[PDB]
From a paper:
Here, we describe crystal structures and biochemical studies showing that the CXXC motif is on a flexible tail, where it contributes little to structure or stability but is available to engage in redox reactions. [name] crystal structures also draw attention to a nonproline cis peptide bond that can isomerize within the protein and to the mobility of glycine‐rich loops in the glycan‐binding site. An understanding of the properties of the [name] CXXC motif and the discovery of internal conformational switches extend existing knowledge relating to the glycan‐binding activity of the protein.
[name] ([name]) is produced in organs that secrete large quantities of enzymes and other proteins into the digestive tract. [name] binds microbial pathogens, and lower [name] expression levels correlate with colorectal cancer, but the physiological function of the protein is poorly understood. One prominent attribute of [name] is its ability to bind glycans, but other aspects of the protein may also contribute to activity. An intriguing feature of [name] is a CXXC motif at the carboxy terminus.
Author numbering: 22 to 163
Write the structure that this text describes.
Amino acid sequence: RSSSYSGEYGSGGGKRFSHSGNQLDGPITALRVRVNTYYIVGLQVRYGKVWSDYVGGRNGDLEEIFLHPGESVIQVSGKYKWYLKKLVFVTDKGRYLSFGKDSGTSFNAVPLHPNTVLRFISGRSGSLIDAIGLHWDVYPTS
């Protein structure tokens, strides 16, 4: 009853992906974002102890952030122009995790219902991240 969805932010190219099935592996516990000179290139998210299937390209440097136990994302903002250019993940331990460059159209995603967190992502990808959507729900008890 508490789930919500923000998106889809970006353009309509590439191939759809969704981490809806990965929810069963656990809460989000880590993020990988690949970034090149121009764009957000790729994404991988750890659900419990299991990484999602990587989406995006091979170009660029990877950044890997491990969330603390019980830390979740409660806001995702960013920018896109043709493809995703910037992503900012804000956590409920007060951390701001920023990736990419400030150029393009801005978006800001927050959960519709209070006391919910980022449970999974979806979007579109190819050699880059074309679009992103954020799926919010209660933090998992089991």
